[PDB]
Amino acid sequence: PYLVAFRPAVLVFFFIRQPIGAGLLAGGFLFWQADRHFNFGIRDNIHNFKQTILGFPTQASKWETFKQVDAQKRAQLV
Amino acid sequence: VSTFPLKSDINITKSGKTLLSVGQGGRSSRTGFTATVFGGTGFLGRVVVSKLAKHGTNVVVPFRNDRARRQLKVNGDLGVVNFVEFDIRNLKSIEDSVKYSDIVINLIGTEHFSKNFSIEDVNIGAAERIAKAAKEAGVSRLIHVSSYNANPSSSSDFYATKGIGEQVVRDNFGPDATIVRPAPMYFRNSPFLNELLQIKALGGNVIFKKEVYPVHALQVGEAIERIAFDDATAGQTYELFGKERYSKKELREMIKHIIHIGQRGYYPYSAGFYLPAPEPFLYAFALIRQYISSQPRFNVDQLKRSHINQEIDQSAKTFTDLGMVPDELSEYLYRYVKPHISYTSQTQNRTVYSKEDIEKLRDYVNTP
């Protein structure tokens, strides 16, 4: 629980000593929080790019498999 | 400094008094003179008062800050330094300071304004009042210290008031009043070098482009000593400046290497050494802190002066008219920024920048 007590102390001293390094680090931190909160989808699309290029089953890959089974099963009944 | 600041042991003031000197010039000696240094608790007054009191000249130091005046007493022997509580809005206290003095030195002047005093009150109203009070008290010599770019028709409220103050001093005290125009002065705790030695200087891309001819504060204090003790300098205007011209951008970058802040490729940029800002923001921030901050910050008028460079009045007299050679900032820059060098402390080996090394560093700074 000690980070809750120390965080105000470390953050202000971080801005005092290195205001530009702190603003850049804090600015990038807020930007990703805006991406998650406002559903910009920038971090998700990067994740979807990494999985596609590294051979992982993507979200679209798993949904394509379902659609292939769905069309296969329907014809099996019709 | 020297050992005896006078050319003789007898000096007849222009008011008619004859003042004899006793002793060889130590602390126990006397010169026979009584001087009043207005603004003696300031940056330049401590230099001037120390030089007068060390040779036995009785100095009257009118003060408004009781703590700042205490260190001045150490400069002279018993009875040499005297203090008068005063205010420029009080006339009785101003007369009491000059009642016995044969020399009056006026160092009162601000580049800012506050809730109580404007730049017109101090640079004109105080200078005029002190000059007139000096004349009614029979003071033989008056010395008024204006700025380097004094001009009655200037766009800067500081340069304008300094220029007008030169006029009003002569119009009250008479044609014999002496005027000094120092350049930016560098010394320990120098206001000129302090802004260059500060790390988080906001808007330096605008402020630090002004070019000047900085002059050693010890020489300016030495020159004033020469002027007061030589009556041939009455009615004269002196421009005290260094031989070399520097821009605050050059000195700012030269200082950075001496402080070794550039030892890390990231630290100066991370620590706020460079803080570029649009001039309208520099105007608004200076304007806002003028009615919010209680301490004198970089104000609006100093922002205007950042564009105006120092112009040497060619009709005025120089150090050579006083028989003195100006000092070179290259030979003194290191020792005055030496306190600010980060690690130093005989870690492995000090980098003592000689006069030759400082000039070599200046070229490297100017190399893109």
Ligand SMILES: NC(=O)C1=CN([C@@H]2O[C@H](COP(=O)(O)OP(=O)(O)OC[C@H]3O[C@@H](n4cnc5c(N)ncnc54)[C@H](OP(=O)(O)O)[C@@H]3O)[C@@H](O)[C@H]2O)C=CC1
């Ligand atoms: N680089 C420089 O320093 C330059 C200096 N000058 C001029 O040289 C003179 C010496 O200034 P400096 O010593 O360098 O630095 P300061 O800013 O300390 O000079 C101001 C002096 O005058 C006093 N002063 C200012 N306003 C008032 C006031 N309303 N009432 C009473 N006293 C007042 C101050 O008293 P207190 O100490 O109690 O506050 C102080 O002693 C100044 O007039 C300045 O304009 C011009 C060009 C270059």
